[PDB]
Design a protein around this ligand. Sequence first.
Ligand SMILES: CN1CCC[C@H](Cn2ccc3ccc(-c4n[nH]c(N)c4C#N)cc32)C1
Ligand SMILES: CN1CCC[C@H](Cn2ccc3ccc(-c4n[nH]c(N)c4C#N)cc32)C1
Lengths: 212, 199
Amino acid sequence: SMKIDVVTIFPEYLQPVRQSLPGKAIDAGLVDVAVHDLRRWTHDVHKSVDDSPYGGGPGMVMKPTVWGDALDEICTSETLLVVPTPAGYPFTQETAWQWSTEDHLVIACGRYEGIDQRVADDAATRMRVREVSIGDYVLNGGEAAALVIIEAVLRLVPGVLSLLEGPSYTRPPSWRGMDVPPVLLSGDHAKIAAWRAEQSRQRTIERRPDLL
Amino acid sequence: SMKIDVVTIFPEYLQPGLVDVAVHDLRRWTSVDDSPYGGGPGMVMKPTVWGDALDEICTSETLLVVPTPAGYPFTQETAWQWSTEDHLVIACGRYEGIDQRVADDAATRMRVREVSIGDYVLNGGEAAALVIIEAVLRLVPGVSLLEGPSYTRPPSWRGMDVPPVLLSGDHAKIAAWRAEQSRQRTIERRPDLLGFDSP
Ligand SMILES: CN1CCC[C@H](Cn2ccc3ccc(-c4n[nH]c(N)c4C#N)cc32)C1
Ligand SMILES: CN1CCC[C@H](Cn2ccc3ccc(-c4n[nH]c(N)c4C#N)cc32)C1
């Protein structure tokens, strides 16, 4: 049973998540994903969420006072506060597994140059905070990271949603002049397993030598 | 100028003038899946439907992108490389993935890239497509160390001060401080980027 709150200035971007949630899991009370517009917590008529960076430089920084109020309302001491950032610790499958048993994730999605660092630093004095990155590329903000994190985590919650895997095949046995490897149709399941292991080994060497 | 075509059995998921993005329902070219030859859990997407779809959508100049957890890593260098392409087609799998012959056949007439966006497991290629699209599009013409922390007003908030150097107006001191924060962060969080063992 997990609650996920996502805070973002683009709530419509989190649409694919609510599109991916089965009725059975929601109705059984296994999962609830709520998305919140950060501007609900702005102080001014212009609904300002950003301001110039101290020390200069390009772009804008998200205001701590707005985020502070949002997190004050949404988080409790039991919350796991997840902050996507390109400077984060790596989000991996081990992370997803660890987080899959949490009662409450709050995902704070930044835009512009990111969120004033005091927001996470203050939050970390009263709850668990995790700054993470989903990979070594640059996005426009945290929303796409949130989509990935939510999917990777929730698919590990029963009933909610190393070597590389080698090639897979299904019908038809011959297609555009390419036959399924005969070993797969041999009924020699020890040989099939060894063939698959070697395919996995080869693929890992070629594509992900960093894993060996 | 870039065209992106995304092919998926879950077009509803993809809802998020120099670039156009089109989403196509794979089922338009039809059951898209069956049990794997050789056994194993789950289902594999049949090559037949994919072949018909890609025949219609792709040309020889197409870069066919296939998200897969067994792919080569998609990185910022990849994003730069793809940013000058005229035409990306992203083939999103579901179930246990797409029959390998789809990529193999396509590779006889266009360039094919099997890639992974990270070391975690998704339910299909759609979220990976959204990530790839976002990372690439922000680099399209006309559109080392980890980033350090950023701060903005007020200079004191909840009794926490913006680091005083950032208020000093000393560009050299600020540059040095920011480099140091980035160094600390990279060593702590991503030591592999500086050629050290991972935790
Ligand atoms: C200062 N920089 C410069 C470039 C653009 C940055 C935009 N941005 C603002 C908030 C924010 C959050 C996450 C991510 C992100 N990028 N790549 C990943 N793997 C991430 C993850 N998790 C990116 C983000 C800000
Ligand atoms: C249990 N099985 C195991 C294999 C994958 C199955 C789901 N699936 C089907 C098609 C497909 C495409 C990409 C991804 C994916 N996962 N993680 C990443 N970095 C990806 C990327 N790019 C996952 C996918 C689920």
